[model samples]
Target chain A: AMRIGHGFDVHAFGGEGPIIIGGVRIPYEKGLLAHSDGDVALHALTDALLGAAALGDIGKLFPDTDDSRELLREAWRRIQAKGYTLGNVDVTIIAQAPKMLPHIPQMRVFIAEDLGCHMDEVNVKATTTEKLGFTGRGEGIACEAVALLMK
Target chain B: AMRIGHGFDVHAFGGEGPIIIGGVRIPYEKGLLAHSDGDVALHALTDALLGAAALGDIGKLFPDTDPAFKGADSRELLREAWRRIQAKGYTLGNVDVTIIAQAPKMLPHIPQMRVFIAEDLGCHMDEVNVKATTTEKLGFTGRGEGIACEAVALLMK
Candidate 1:
């Protein structure tokens, strides 16, 4: 059996500096304001994994935590326990600031490691909204991810 | 062989009323401002289908500069994209769409939306899922500045 899932998440910018995305802390003037560490990339990808397996979302699984990286690993573990494995995952980051292009390689590495897949099985792409909306205004960041799972 | 693709799109409010989503015209205060009918759901789904097949995006396939696309129906656009994907010898496995909006509740129209999408892709309605969610008044979509949609598609050959 094979299934596909999509996840979307958003977080406003505030509180501190050097925000975390895909488990990598990048230099930034503002951190994401959230109950957790606000790693929007990991959160989105975790939801995608859980959705693929019909296991529920991150909020339902880990409602009171700041460790999205650990959350991702645990999600992957559950899916693997279900006799499913990763085919590939793709993620897109929507933002107008902080130049995500330079850190995409590291992001892919972290995601692949968490998912127990090769780096080539993970892809990260970033695009700006052309200064149109909240992300374009530098007020926040949004992420979308899709994953394929096979049994 | 199988592949998965994802797409995200946003269109701000402007112009006329009775906005179109998933080919269903719903009563609304403002329409989506765009070169076409501004069906963000179909647009995102089209991009997902194309992405799964490694084809170019909607912007590249149907450029805004082309006057022929002005006021074009997004259903036709989605159909055309699916045609290209079919030409690649792949079949639709399934598709799921999430509409993020702050106004004009999508629940009443989601069933019809799924029917239209299933018909467009030549798949069963069971293989298509349309879901609606709100951002809790958090960002652009939450504030009702515009509507956003994301879609994931599975294709197999």
Candidate 2:
């Protein structure tokens, strides 16, 4: 049987850093500030996959202040520890942004490499509805991801 | 700590089988026509229980189209699984159901079977609430979502 986990992550705009989406770095103006590279979109998907596996969410296994934690190694540690193998992840990144389309592919590879799995196992897509709600009106960035895990 | 999951299931009236909601098996004119003996309410609850345990939802395993489940008694399947988990030391804490429909008076059967359902889940009858609602004018169970049930169950390890 497979476990399906869904994760939702939302971050308000603040501070400055190289914006990271789906693990791909992007040049941008305002980056959301978390302890790590506040990649709001990717972090949500990561939590979802980990939750599905019953590996616990990101904060459970790999919190910012963990002794072994670092910006780059957080996601890999969580995904590998759970005996779950990856199935596939489909995530929708909701954001009113600086255009998220061009950076999706490489983002997939970054996650794929970290999980030590095939590239096709990760599917990430970004969409905007042209100002229907918060993302459309260009206020903040919100991302959601759902991941499937096979035992 | 244990993980939790949620699920929702709906079906249109197939016009062949009489309406069956929960485990009471109502005497309505039409029931769902599917690969199994269709009990939309029970099936939805089964899926929700499985999801909360990090097991997949109903459609992935006991698929409606599968011959192994043809005209099966869904209540038995649901109870059997609930019992197995019970033996493993998992005690179901609570469950709440929102039943959507416009006909057949489900209110009377609710209290009686709350004891039955909770008993099978290894919990008390008071922990279950089977609520009734109408869509006013909406989808299949307006009657448009078609005899649907959404349930949330909590279990303690």
Candidate 3:
């Protein structure tokens, strides 16, 4: 029996960079600030897969200090190289503004396609903090995902 | 092996009502404020129970909106529900809570009675919170015990 791992990624709003999550270009009032497309959801899921296989984290394997090409080909190749397949992933995004309802369908397809898994295997659920946290304050979007990778 | 599900309950300070928690009533200035006994602790346990069974939530069963329950004792219902929940492919692993009340010296009895309570909930002493605290008189919990609790259960999937 292996172990279950969860990954959470969050960043503040109003940044200048490509915003990507689950490899989807979501329509939003603001974009995430990152060296890459700033897809926290994909980054978190990638980290969870690596963690389940005990390979390491996004920082340790990819090492932003070195991998300069700003595309997911390297990340995709990395998971394939690890000899693992998807189990089931449940991803949830918490945001207060910009209305996440319209973007869910696309996000789901993008996440499933990116992982080479069925759409049912990936559940991307979005919720609001009920004006509770920085999200309620219209800060940036926060994404969290739990991934079960089978080797 | 069976899955584990446990619950905990608590109440705040109020002079008008009689205090009761975990189905145990004690002499206190304040009591719970539900249609029955307003035990915040028991409410949390109800949520955990529903979570274990994947039955949606406690609200679906016991809606506060029900006029029939203008004043009700949650512990009485929660304890009863735990029996059925245990029968449904699950047993409580552990139940834990931090009672934030100043006036009551409930800590002295918690360790001793945890086993008895566990036996009632179909769990073990290790499956309970086994601790109580005072808010140091700062917040809602501090000034008067406006009880609050959180619980988790592992479902046998």
Candidate 4:
């Protein structure tokens, strides 16, 4: 069996210092505005996991506030029990500032460990949207992720 | 024998009329700017299919410098690429796609787009999924400047 899911998320700058993505806090002049950590990367991956498992979306599980990492683990376990093993996940970060390519290696490791998957199974890429969008204007950052689960 | 790949594509609005996505034309004030028809949805899906088969991206297959692909129909490109994948002994498993835009609500068109894609890919309708979302009025999409598409493809070999 092959299952896949796609997710997209965006957040405006919180006007604060530093930005956290995939559990790595990058030195930045601004932060994402959100009730929690505003980790768009994690949020996108979480939605992909839930979608693959036929669970729901991040908003459906947002009551936990900042426990997205745990949500992913539990979803993985549930799908594993059903005979699904994660094949891999590819994520793209769309931002115009802070040069995400410099941090993608660390982001890959963080996601691999969090999802309990091999480092090679997790891939992260960054794009600037050619400075044509909101990220181009430096108002916010967006993240998109796709996960593959196989049984 | 399952292979998966992800693809992302973006194009700024060409400031034209009618948006064509997944081969379905929707009434929108602006279309995307590109060398081709700028079907971001099919372009993203094409890239995923190529990536899953370890083939190169759209730019490599259909270079802008080539006059043969000038304003090319994106579905033709997808079919040509699908032939290559099918020849490689892989069958379609499933595909999920996400469209990022702030305006021209995609909810009504998702079903049509899904069916069109399934037909072109020769897959079951249930095997294709299309989703829509916004940036909460934050980015270029927030300003309705462009539309972006992302897709994940699973192939059985």
Candidate 5:
């Protein structure tokens, strides 16, 4: 059996420097505001993993007060226990600033490690809204991810 | 072989009523602003199908400058995109979509939307799912300034 899932998340910027995404801390002017470290990329991927397996979303698994990376790892473990394996995941980070291209390679590495999959199975891409919407105005960052699971 | 793809799109509110989404015309206060019919849901799904086959995005296939696409029905665009995917020897495994909006409830219209999507993709209604969500009044979609949609597609050979 094969299944695919999609997840979307957004976070406002208002904390401090060096925001975390895909479990990688990148230096930036401001951080994303959230209950956790505000790694929108990882959060989105975690939801995708759970959604693919017919499980609930991140909020159901972890209500509040959690590490985004650990949350992702936990979701992967659940998916594995359900007799499913990762095929590949592609994530797109929508942000206006901070130059995510330089950090994408490292993001993929961290994501691959967390999911217990090879780097080739993880793909991360960054894009901007051409300064049109909220992301383009640098108010916050948003991420969308898709995951494929096979058994 | 199997491949998965995701797509996201947003369009600000502007224009008249009865906006099209997933090929269902819904009565709304304002329509989505776009070059075409502003069917953000179908546009996102079209991009997902194209992306899964590595055929590029909707913009690449139908440039904004093309005169033939003015106010084009997004259902045709999605069907054409699926035709291209079939040419690559790929068939739809399933697809799921989420529409993010704060106004004009989508729940009442989702069933018909799924019917249209399933017919366009040549798949059973069970293979297509359409759902809606809100940002809890957080950003552009929350503010009712625009609507956003994201979709994921699974394809197999």
Candidate 6:
């Protein structure tokens, strides 16, 4: 059986941590405002995995506490234990600052490691809003992720 | 064999026909700005299907530079892309889509949109799911300046 899921998350800047995204620390002028490190990418991806299995959502799974790299990996492990493997995951990061292109390779590596999949199975794309919105103004960052699960 | 693909698209408001979304027209004060009929939802779904098949993207397959696609029906684009997937001997497993906008409210139309997608893909309606959300009035979509959609498609053989 095969199924797919989609997820989206957003966070504003000027908060805690060092702009941790996809578990990779990036040099940026500001970080996301959140109770945790605020990796919107992984948050969305985790939600995608949960949604694919019809297993509820990230919020329900982890109601409180900040989502961290180790936490995300644990989430992936739980999904794998359910007899499902990743088909592929595609993600798009919507932001206007600190270009994500240079950091994509590392992001892919992190996701591949967490999901226990080949690098090719994880894709991350980044785009700007052509300076037309809040992200364009560098007020925050948004990310969307879709995951395919096969059993 | 199974392959997965994802798509993302956005269109500003105030341009073409009625607010055609998910192939269902909605009564709205304004429409999307685009060269075609501006069905952002279908365009994203079409891209996902083509991408899963490794055929190409909707932009490359139906380049806006081409005059034939001007005001073209997005449903036609989806069917055209489906043809390629079918030729590859792949059938729809499932598709999940997210429509991002603030105005007009999309929940009421989700059931119909799923039906349309299932019919176009030649699959059961259960294989399709449509969801909607807002940027919490933080982006262009929140301001109702445009709408964006994202899709994930699964194909099996």
* Number of the predicted model whose DockQ against the real structure is largest: 4
- Please write out the lDDT profile of model 1 over residues A1-151, one tens digit for every residue: 7887878899999977799998888899888998878899999999998999999999888876437898899988988999998887878788888878678789888988888778866767665454668797899999988888888
Q: Between candidates 2 and 5, name the one with more favorable DockQ.
A: 5
Candidate 3 segments exceeding 4 Å error: A15-19, A67-77, B1-157
Chain B TM-score for the candidates in order: 0.98, 0.86, 0.72, 0.96, 0.98, 0.96
**Where's the lowest-lDDT run of ten residues in candidate 2 chain B?**
B1-10
Top candidate, metric lDDT: 1
**Residue pairs that clash (backbone atoms under 3 angstroms), model 6:** none
Q: Which ten residues in a row have the lowest lDDT in candidate 1 chain B?
A: B51-60
Query: What is model 3's DockQ versus the real complex?
Result: 0.08
Q: Flag the better candidate by lDDT, 3 or 6.
A: 6
Q: Clash pairs of candidate 5?
A: none
True contacts kept of each: 0.20, 0.00, 0.00, 0.52, 0.29, 0.35
| Chain A only, candidate 2, TM-score | 0.81
Specify the highest-TM-score model's number.
4
What DockQ would candidate 2 receive versus the native complex? Answer: 0.05
TM-score of model 1 (CA atoms): 0.66
- Which order, best to worst by DockQ? 4, 6, 5, 1, 3, 2
lDDT per residue for candidate 2 within A46-94, as digits (tens), equals 7777677676777776667771123224554655565666666655566
Which CAPRI tier for candidate 2? Answer: incorrect
Q: lDDT of each structure? A: 0.85, 0.63, 0.57, 0.81, 0.85, 0.82
DockQ of each: 0.20, 0.05, 0.08, 0.35, 0.23, 0.27
User: CA shift at B91, candidate 4, in angstroms?
Assistant: 0.8
Those runs of model 1 whose alpha carbons end farther than 4 Å from true positions after fitting are A1-86, A96-133
In angstroms, give how far residue B40 of model 6 lies from its true place: 0.4
Worst 10 residues of 5 chain B by lDDT: B129-138
Evaluate residue B132 in candidate 1 and report its C-alpha lDDT on the 0 to 100 scale: 92
True contacts kept of 1: 0.20
Overall local distance difference test of candidate 4: 0.81
**Global lDDT for candidate 5?**
0.85
- lDDT by residue for model 2 (B25-90), tens: 677776665556666667767755664454444555575557878777877878866765566666
Candidate number that wins on DockQ, 5 or 6: 6
When sorted by TM-score, best at the front, the candidate numbers are: 4, 6, 5, 1, 2, 3
